[PDB]
Ligand binder design. Structure first.
Ligand code: 3PE
Ligand code: 3PE
Lengths: 569, 569
C-alpha cells in the first residue's frame, strides 16, 4: 500500500543516501573480488614468474578491510535512521494513548498495549529498512555480475541467459507434476489410516464377542496396505529429484559443447571461464532474495496500519463550557443509569443520590453490586448513558475535563507512585507552584514524616519502582499526604481493605479522619468503624438505591442494611 | 542406546547392505566430477586442444545418469527395509493393545493412541535410517574429498588441514566474545522497557492528578534512551561479521602467499588450484551434516522407547482357568464396592443385587451416576475394588475371561459395526460354526429382514463405515440380531434410546420384547414402558440401593420411585 509514513522519515534523509552510497560499494567490492580469479588462475599459477601471488594477498585483504568498513558504515547510517523514526513514532503513540477514554485501556490490557510501542513499532523499521538494503545491495550485485559476465565473454555469457529461463521452466513443470502426484496418492493413504481408526474405537466389541484372532488378521491386511502405499509415495519423491539435476546437467552439457566451435570460442583460457561460471552461481543468491522484497515490505508496512489505527482513534469527549475554580457546593445524582462498554446487562439502573456540602455519605454494596462504579462517573472516567449528574448546581458535561478532575482526589489503597522523588510524588504535576516547605507541612499533617525521615536522602529519595520499594501500608499514607496538599474539595475515599496491622493502620485511620473535616466525602465503606459516623448511610441494592437513611433509621427496618450489618458480624 | 530394535531388522540385512554399496558409489560420483575440473581448466579450455570439450559433456551426462540410478536404488532399497520394520512393529502394537485392560483405553488415550501406530512408529525408521544415510554417504564423501585433495597436491592440501583449526577456534572465540556482550547489553533494554511499562499502568493517576505534560516530557527521556541503547546492540553485532570475515580471509591470503615461495613448496598448474580449492568448499556441507548424527539417532531411538513402554506393559488379568459352557444360574451381587481408576471418590459403594433365573431387573437411577457402572462389572471390563460378584454359584475370578465374556451380550443404542459384509457383523468371530441359513433365520426373527433385503446384494454388502452405512435404528436392530444369533444366556440392555420414530421404534421394541423371553435381563432403564412390565425394580443413586420393589409395591412408598414417574410426568 501507499502510506503517510514518509513525512516522519523525510527529515532523516541524510542517513538513507549514505547507506546507499556506502552500500553499493559493499556490492561493487564483492564483484571486484571475483574478478581476481582471472589474473590468478590464468597467469598467476600456470606459468613462472610468481609475482601475481605476492601482488594478490595485498588486494584480497584490501578488498576485505574495505568490505568491513563499508559494512559497519552501512549498519550505523541505517540504524541511526531506523532508530530516529522508531523514536519519533513511539513518542506520538505515548502522546495520544495518555488522552483516550479510560474504557479503552481495559478491553486492551497494559501488556498487550505495550506490544504496540516496543514490538510492533520496530517492525515498521525492521522490515522496511530490511527491504531497502536488499533492493539496493542485492539489486546492485546483479547489475555488477551482469557487466562482469558480459565484459569478459559475451559469447558464453549470452548462452547463459537463453538456457537459464528454458532450464528454469523445465525444472518447474517437472517439479510440479511430481507435486500433484505425490499429493494425489497422499489422500489415498488417508483412506487407510482412517480404516485403522475404525477398529481401535470398538475395543469393547472386540473383547465381548470373542473376536481377538479375527481382528488381528485384519491388521495383517490393512497394515500391509499402508506400507505398500507408503512405499509408493517415496518412489514418487525419489524420482522427483534425479531428473531435475539431469535437466540441469544437460544445461552444463551444451555450454561446454557450445564452446568448442571456432567462432563462439576464440580462446576462453583458464580464467574467463572460472569468472563467468563462478559469477553464475554467485548471481543466484541475490535473485532468491530480491523476490521477497514485496513479501517483506508488506510485512513491515502492514504493521504500520495496526498502529496508525491507534494513532487516529477518537480521544475523550472534551465538550467544555466553563472553568470551575472550586466546587463550593454539592454533587447530586438525579436518575442516572449506564452500562460498561463491553458488557450487555445494565450495571447500575436509575439512581438518585446527593452529596451535601460539609457532609459525608457511605455506599455498601459489599456483595458486589457495583458499589465501586459510583466513583468513576463523578470523575468522568466512564461517561453516563442516561440521566444527569450535577456539581455545584450544573451538569458535569458542561465543564472542561481539566478543571473537573482538578476538584477531585481519589484516595484509595491502590495508588500508582511515579518513578521520581518523594518531593514530587507528594506534589505531583504542580511542583512549580508548591514549595518544599509546604510539602513538609503536608507530610507532617498526614503523619507520614516518620517513613520519609527514615529515607537516606530525606525528601529526594527515589520512591517509585526500581527505587526504595515502599510497602503497601506506606503507599496509602502518601496518598493522604498527596490529597491533603492539593486541597481538592471532593473526596471519594475507597477504604476497600480493612487491615488490622496496628500502629501502621492506626496512623492511616487517624490520618484519614483528619482529612474528613471539611471536604465533602464519599466512602465506599468496607470498615464498619467509619460507616456509623457518616451523616447519611446509603446502600446499593443491585442496580438501584432502595434503602436510604441514617444508621439507626435503616437498622430498625430490616431490609438488607440490617442483614449487611449481620454479614459484617 | 538400548537398541533392542535390531532383532526386528536382522531378517532384513539385504536392503541395508545394498543401500551402502549403492550409496558409496553415489558419494564417489560427486568426487569423480570435481576431478573433471583439472583436465578442463588446464588441458583444453586454454589451448588449441578442442577435444577435452568434445568427450567431456557426455561424461557429465554419464555420471549424472549414474548418480540418479544410484540414488534411486539407494532410496528404494532403504524404503523397503524402513517399511518392513515399521509394518512389523504396527502388528505387535496392534496385537498387545487389543488384550489389555479397558481402563487404559477410556481417557488416558482416545485419539492420541493412533499417533503411536501412525506417527511415533514412523518416526523410528525415519530418524534411524536418516542417521545411516547421513553417516555412510557423508562419511565416504569426506574420504573421497580427502583423498582427491591429497592426491592432486599434498603440499597445498596439508596447509589447509593444519591451517583450518587455527581459523575455526579463532572464529568461535571471536564470536563468543560478541555473543556474551550482546547478551550483557540485552538486559539494559529490559530494564528500560520495564521503566516505560511502569508509566502505562497508572493512567487513572495520570489523568485525575492533572499531569499530562510531565508524563510526556518524561517519555521524551525514557524513549531517547531506548534508541541509544538499541543502536548500541546493532553496533556491537555488525562488528562481529566484518571481523570473522577478515579472520577467514587472512587464511586465504596466507595460503596464496605460501604458494609464492618456490623452494620446494608448491608447483601447481591452475587446475590443481581449482580441484583442491573447490573440494574444501564442497567438504563443509558433509561436515556440518555429520555433526547432527547423534542428535538424530536419539530423536529416533528415544521415540522408540515410547513404543517399548506401551509394549511390554501389563495385559489384562487372565488369572483363573475354570470353564463355563452355559451360565444356567443367576448373577448374585453381594456387598460389592468399586471405584474407577484415575479417581478416588467412590462411584459405587456396597451394593447387593440379584438376577434370578428367568427374571429381569431395572436399574433406575436416571440422575446420571451409579446405574451405568452395574453393567461393566459382570463382563469384567473393570475389576472390583472389594467384595465379590458371583455367577452361577461361583465368583467371576475363577472362570476364564474368554469363557465369561462370551456368556453376556451388551445390547445398546451405540453399537460398533465392523467394516465387513452384513454376514460377519451378524456372526462375528464365529463364521465357521454358524451357517448362512441360521443367519437368515436370526435376521428374520429380529425383523431386520426388511432392511437387509433392501441392500443390493442382500447378505454380502459392506455394512460398516466406508460402505453402505446405516441409521442408528438399523444398527440397534443388527445388535439385537447378533445377540439373538449368539444365544448367550445373559442379557444387559442399555436402552438409553428415548427414540420416538414410529415404524422403526415399533420394530425395535417388538424385537427387544421377543429377545427377553429367556436370557435373564439387567435392563438399564430410561423409557417407562419396560419399567412397568418387569419382575423387580431397584433404584441406585451414588451407589446407594435405597428402594427395591415392584412397580406397584414401590409406588405406595414415595421414596424416589414415586418421584421417578414425576420426572417423566
Ligand atoms: C548502479 C550502481 C553502481 C554499480 C557499480 C557496479 C560496478 C561493477 C564493476 C565491475 C568491474 C569488473 C571488471 C574489473 C576489471 C578490473 C581490472 C582487471 O582486473 O583487469 C583484468 C584484465 C587485464 O588482465 P591483465 O592483468 O593484463 O592480465 C593479462 C590478461 N589481459 O582486463 C581486461 O582487459 C579484461 C580481459 C580482456 C578482455 C578482452 C575482450 C573485451 C570485450 C569487450 C566487450 C564489451 C561488451 C560488448 C557486448 C555488450 C552486450 C550488451
Ligand atoms: C602425504 C601423502 C603424499 C602422497 C604423494 C603421492 C604422489 C603425488 C604425485 C602428484 C603429481 C602431480 C599430480 C598429477 C596427477 C595426474 C593425474 C591424472 O592425470 O589424472 C588421473 C585420474 C583422472 O584421469 P582423467 O582426467 O579421467 O583422464 C582423462 C584423460 N587424460 O585421476 C583421478 O581420477 C584422481 C581422482 C580420484 C578420485 C578417487 C575417489 C575415490 C572415492 C572412494 C570413496 C569410497 C571409499 C570407501 C569409504 C568407506 C566408508 C565406510
Amino acid at each position: 500500500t501507499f502510506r503517510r509514513l514518509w513525512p516522519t522519515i523525510a527529515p532523516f534523509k541524510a542517513g538513507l543516501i549514505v547507506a546507499g552510497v556506502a552500500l553499493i560499494l559493499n556490492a561493487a567490492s564483492d564483484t571486484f573480488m571475483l574478478s581476481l580469479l582471472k589474473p590468478l588462475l590464468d597467469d598467476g599459477f600456470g606459468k613462472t614468474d610468481r609475482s601475481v601471488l605476492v601482488w594478490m594477498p595485498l588486494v584480497v585483504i584490501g578488498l576485505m578491510i574495505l568490505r568491513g568498513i563499508t559494512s559497519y558504515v552501512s549498519s550505523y547510517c541505517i540504524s541511526w535512521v531506523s532508530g530516529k523514526v522508531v523514536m519519533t513514532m513511539r513518542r506520538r503513540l505515548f502522546g495520544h494513548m495518555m488522552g483516550m477514554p479510560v474504557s479503552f485501556f481495559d478491553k486492551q490490557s497494559t501488556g498487550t498495549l505495550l506490544s504496540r510501542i516496543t514490538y510492533d513499532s520496530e517492525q515498521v523499521a525492521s522490515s522496511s529498512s530490511g527491504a531497502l538494503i536488499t533492493v539496493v545491495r542485492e539489486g546492485a550485485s546483479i547489475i555488477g555480475l551482469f557487466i562482469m559476465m558480459f565484459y569478459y565473454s559475451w559469447q558464453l555469457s549470452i548462452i547463459l541467459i537463453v538456457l537459464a529461463p528454458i532450464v528454469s521452466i523445465a525444472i518447474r513443470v517437472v517439479s510440479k507434476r511430481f507435486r500433484n502426484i505425490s499429493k494425489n496418492m497422499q489422500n489415498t493413504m488417508g483412506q487407510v489410516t482412517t480404516s485403522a481408526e475404525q477398529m481401535l474405537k470398538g475395543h469393547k466389541e472386540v473383547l465381548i464377542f470373542g473376536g481377538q484372532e479375527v481382528e488381528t488378521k485384519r491388521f495383517d491386511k490393512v497394515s500391509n496396505r499402508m506400507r505398500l502405499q507408503g512405499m509408493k509415495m517415496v518412489s514418487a519423491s525419489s524420482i522427483s529429484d534425479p531428473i531435475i539435476q539431469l535437466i540441469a546437467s544437460l544445461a552444463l552439457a551444451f555450454v561446454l559443447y557450445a564452446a568448442s566451435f571456432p567462432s563462439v570460442m576464440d580462446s576462453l583460457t583458464a580464467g574467463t571461464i572460472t569468472v563467468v561460471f563462478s559469477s553464475m552461481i554467485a548471481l543466484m543468491r541475490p535473485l532468491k532474495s530480491l523476490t521477497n522484497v514485496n513479501a517483506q515490505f508488506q510485512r513491515g508496512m502492514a504493521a504500520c496500519q495496526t498502529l496508525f489505527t491507534i494513532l487516529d482513534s477518537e480521544q475523550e469527549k472534551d465538550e467544555g463550557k466553563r472553568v470551575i475554580e472550586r466546587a463550593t457546593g454539592d454533587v447530586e445524582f438525579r436518575n442516572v443509569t449506564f452500562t460498561y462498554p463491553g458488557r450487555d446487562v445494565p450495571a447500575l439502573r436509575n439512581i438518585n443520590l446527593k452529596i451535601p456540602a460539609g457532609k459525608t455519605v457511605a455506599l455498601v454494596g459489599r456483595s458486589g453490586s457495583g458499589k465501586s462504579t459510583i466513583a468513576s462517573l463523578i470523575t468522568r472516567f466512564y461517561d453516563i448513558d442516561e440521566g444527569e449528574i450535577l456539581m455545584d448546581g450544573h451538569d458535569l458535561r458542561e465543564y472542561t475535563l481539566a478543571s473537573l478532575r482538578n476538584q477531585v482526589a481519589l484516595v484509595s489503597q491502590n495508588v500508582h507512585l511515579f518513578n521520581d522523588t518523594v518531593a514530587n510524588n507528594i506534589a505531583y504535576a504542580r511542583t512549580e507552584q508548591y514549595s518544599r516547605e509546604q510539602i513538609e507541612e503536608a507530610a507532617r499533617m498526614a503523619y507520614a514524616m516518620d517513613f520519609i525521615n527514615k529515607m537516606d536522602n530525606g525528601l529526594d529519595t527515589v520512591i517509585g519502582e526500581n527505587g526504595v520499594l515502599l510497602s503497601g501500608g506506606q503507599r496509602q499514607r502518601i496518598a493522604i499526604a498527596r490529597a491533603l496538599l492539593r486541597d481538592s474539595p471532593i473526596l471519594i475515599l475507597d477504604e476497600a481493605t480493612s487491615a488490622l496491622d496496628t500502629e501502621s493502620e492506626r496512623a492511616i485511620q487517624a490520618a484519614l479522619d483528619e482529612l474528613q473535616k471539611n471536604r465533602t466525602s464519599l466512602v465506599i465503606a468496607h470498615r464498619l468503624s467509619t460507616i456509623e459516623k457518616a451523616d447519611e448511610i446509603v446502600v446499593v441494592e443491585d442496580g438501584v438505591i432502595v434503602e436510604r437513611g441514617t444508621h439507626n433509621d435503616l437498622l430498625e427496618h430490616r431490609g438488607v442494611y440490617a442483614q449487611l450489618h449481620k454479614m459484617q458480624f
